[PDB]
């Protein structure tokens, strides 16, 4: 289905679809392929989960439901039609879909059609309403009555299937074919009208049963056992988890990249217990104001250093021209995209990746030179008034990029040379 990497890369229409959904994706994609000419497959190669998420979001569909039962008759009536529910009616009733498609594009209007439909007795029949000759219906819609009837016959023919003997009430009533007793009660048998005909409640009940069967066979779509069926689980062994416990052997390496004696510590301990019981003065704790002044110097130095650390506690406010700010952000973004794709190629590790690595190396070099030329532009646009800040802002991505270039050169010298 539409789930492989090849399928997701193939769906150019879906790619354009979420392209048109976003705006920074036009920005990024335009710079990536319209401006830089990157292979758009490798563009989308990162965004594969996003593509699949968009596809699966677009791909779901609802389950069937009794749309005619949700239809209410609502003096006068005003049509308040919902197109999704109109298509729901179409899907649930292909007869109604057909009656739409041979009359509205031929004879009259859609709201006129639906007014005729709500007027029609075919609507009442298809809904849970007993038909009545007092009702006149709509003649145009009610011409489809026998067509819907033969649809019902064909659908019932489809719905017929053999039954399991474990639950077969037909086999149950065919237990004794020579039962000769008495005629059962009118109460508990299906009653009829005065002239022997039925009222049709059996028809409406078999119709709603047909609706249920159509439901469940819509569920039963494309998208022996009695031994298991008759198991009595209540007298069986309880399930126990096979979860594995874990122990932990403990032997850690010592930290890598004079010794005191009991006599000497005991001597000092005796002496300091003697000093402890001897004396203790709070007043002697006051310092000499000179070594204390050096303490003041050290403390104040630490305060100054950490205060300058705290002095640099939406992005930050900047005094850039907004266009050059956007241009440099754009350049940073496409350089980051290039760098990530180059790392993807490099960490992949194949000889098939070699030309890709070389070409992305060329692109990184081009980005470097374009960064330098941008620095020349902000040079002769500022006189290095705040072109220094431009260079420093674009610095760390450039450092990482050129570090990657050095890594590529080093591995080239490692393998080839």
């Amino acid at each position: 289905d539409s789930l492989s990497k090849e399928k997701l890369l193939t769906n150019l229409k879906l790619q354009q679809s979420l392209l048109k959904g976003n705006k920074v994706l036009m920005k990024v994609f335009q710079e990536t392929v319209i401006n830089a000419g990157l292979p758009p497959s490798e563009f989308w190669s990162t965004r594969i989960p996003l593509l699949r998420a968009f596809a699966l979001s677009t791909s779901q569909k609802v389950g069937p439901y009794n749309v005619l039962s949700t239809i209410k008759p609502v003096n006068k009536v005003n049509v308040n039609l919902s197109r999704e529910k109109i298509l729901n009616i179409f899907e649930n009733y292909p007869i109604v879909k057909k009656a739409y498609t041979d009359n509205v594009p031929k004879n009259f209007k859609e709201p006129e059609f639906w007014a005729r439909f709500f007027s029609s007795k075919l609507f009442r029949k298809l809904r849970g309403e007993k038909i009545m000759q007092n009702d006149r219906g709509d003649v145009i819609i009610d011409r489809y009555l026998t067509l819907d009837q033969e649809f019902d016959r064909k659908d019932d023919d489809m719905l017929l299937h053999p039954v399991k003997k474990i639950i077969d009430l037909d086999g149950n009533i065919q237990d004794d074919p020579v039962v000769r007793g008495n005629r059962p009660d009118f109460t508990m048998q299906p009653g009829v009208d005065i002239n022997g005909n039925s009222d049709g409640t059996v028809d409406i009940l078999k119709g709603m049963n047909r609706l249920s069967e159509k439901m469940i066979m819509a569920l039963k779509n494309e998208y022996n056992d009695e031994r298991n069926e008759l198991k009595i689980d209540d007298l069986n062994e309880s399930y126990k988890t096979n979860y594995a416990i874990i122990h932990l052997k403990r032997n850690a390496h010592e930290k890598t990249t004079l010794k005191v004696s009991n006599q000497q510590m005991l001597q000092q301990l005796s002496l300091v217990m003697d000093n402890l019981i001897n004396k203790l003065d709070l007043n002697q704790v006051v310092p000499n104001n000179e070594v204390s002044n050096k303490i003041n110097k050290r403390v104040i130095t630490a305060i100054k250093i950490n205060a300058k650390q705290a002095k640099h506690n939406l992005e930050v406010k900047s005094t850039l021209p907004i266009d050059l700010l956007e241009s440099c952000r754009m350049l940073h973004t496409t350089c980051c995209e290039f760098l990530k794709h180059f790392y993807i190629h490099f960490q992949s590790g194949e000889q098939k990746q070699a030309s890709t690595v070389k070409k992305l190396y060329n692109h990184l070099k081009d980005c470097i030179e374009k960064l330098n030329e941008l620095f020349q532009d902000v040079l002769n646009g500022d006189g290095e008034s705040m072109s220094n800040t431009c260079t420093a802002y674009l610095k760390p991505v450039l450092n990482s990029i050129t570090l990657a270039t050095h890594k590529y050169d080093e591995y080239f010298n490692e393998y080839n040379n």
Binding site: L248, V316, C336, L339
Partner: protein, 355 residues
């Protein structure tokens, strides 16, 4: 006579926690909470309504899950009007899903549920997930039925084949299909289809769902994983970030490809490698090193001490409230027992006692 009822209730409670095991429990987690926002949760039957409390409890659940287990990504898909709507991709930042849930606050829950569609696109979202990550889904549900487009059993078989588990927290009562899901997905266990009895029970259930789950021996995936500790800088100049492409005063620096990021514990956007701190990995060590329960000594027998070893307070006097750590042979009060067993994760008696 209330103390006898409290004692027998504590006995019937402790009968479940008598067995404490050092099972291998998942750390690299993958948790999905789908939300239904349908007509059922519009009931004000619990105050103020089911939608509001599940919103609040989901806020708490997000906070607790990210606090305890910051080494997982969190995705939320809402269910509404016969459609399941993705609102939260799996991410390391909880704040994104917090904002998405805040959007879910003001909108109106309505419609009917479709676990088939919900679980199908949850499967699809869970598809590009590495092997060590434990794919598991929490599902909240208030209906007693489910309108669906097609079969659920094919989805059940696919989910079992793709090694993803589920846990259902139903609202009203048991639904047989949800029982079937929990049993078949959960190797025949019935310890996953849970029904609350009040909102406090719902709170306790959410707290229970916070915890990591044990893994199975047959589901063996024992391997290594590449890891990298980054380094934080505090620069004078604001600098462009790789992730959000904007000027940052500080930021960690990539250990491998020397780029910079804005938040942790996150993977690299550039060298594409996971970056953490040792605090984050040690955070689950109480799960890795569980604590034994502490036993009250009986009131009849002679007592080692008459006041609490840890908090240093007098033991109250019918029964004896002296919870003993047999690993350190010291008795403690109930308050200290609660704190050491839940908040703390060490026994100071065993810290003082040399091994």
């Amino acid at each position: 006579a209330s103390l006898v009822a409290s004692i027998v209730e504590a006995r019937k409670k402790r009968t479940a926690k008598k067995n404490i095991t050092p099972y291998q429990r998942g750390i690299i987690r993958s948790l999905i909470l789908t939300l239904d926002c349908s007509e059922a949760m519009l009931e004000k039957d619990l105050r103020p309504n089911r939608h509001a409390m599940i919103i609040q409890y989901a806020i708490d659940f997000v906070h607790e899950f990210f606090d305890q287990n910051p080494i997982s990504q969190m995705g939320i898909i809402i269910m509404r009007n016969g459609l399941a709507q993705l609102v939260s991709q799996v991410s390391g930042n909880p704040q994104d899903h917090i904002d998405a849930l805040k959007s879910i606050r003001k909108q109106e829950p309505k419609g009917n549920p479709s676990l088939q569609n919900a679980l199908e696109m949850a499967r699809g979202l869970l598809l590009p997930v590495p092997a060590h990550c434990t794919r598991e889904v929490l599902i909240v549900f208030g209906s007693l039925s489910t309108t669906d487009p097609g079969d659920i059993h094919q989805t059940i078989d696919s989910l079992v084949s793709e090694k993803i588990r589920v846990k259902v927290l139903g609202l009203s009562a048991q639904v047989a299909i949800c029982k079937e899901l929990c049993k078949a997905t959960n190797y025949g266990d019935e310890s996953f289809y849970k029904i609350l009895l009040d909102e406090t029970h719902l709170k306790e259930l959410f707290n229970e769902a916070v915890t990591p789950l044990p893994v199975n021996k047959i589901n063996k995936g024992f391997t290594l994983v590449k890891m990298g500790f980054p380094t934080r800088i505090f620069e004078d100049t604001p600098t462009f970030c790789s992730c959000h492409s904007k000027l940052v005063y500080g930021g960690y620096f990539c250990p491998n490809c020397h780029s910079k990021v804005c938040s942790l514990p996150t993977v690299c956007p550039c060298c594409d490698l996971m970056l953490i701190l040792s605090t984050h990995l040690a955070r689950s060590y109480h799960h890795l090193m569980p604590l034994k329960t502490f036993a009250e000594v009986p009131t009849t027998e002679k007592f080692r001490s008459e006041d609490c070893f840890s908090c240093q307070s007098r033991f109250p006097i019918l029964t004896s409230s002296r919870y003993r750590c047999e690993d350190c042979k010291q008795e403690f009060c109930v308050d200290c027992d609660v704190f050491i067993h839940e908040i703390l994760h060490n026994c100071p008696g065993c810290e003082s006692k040399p091994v």
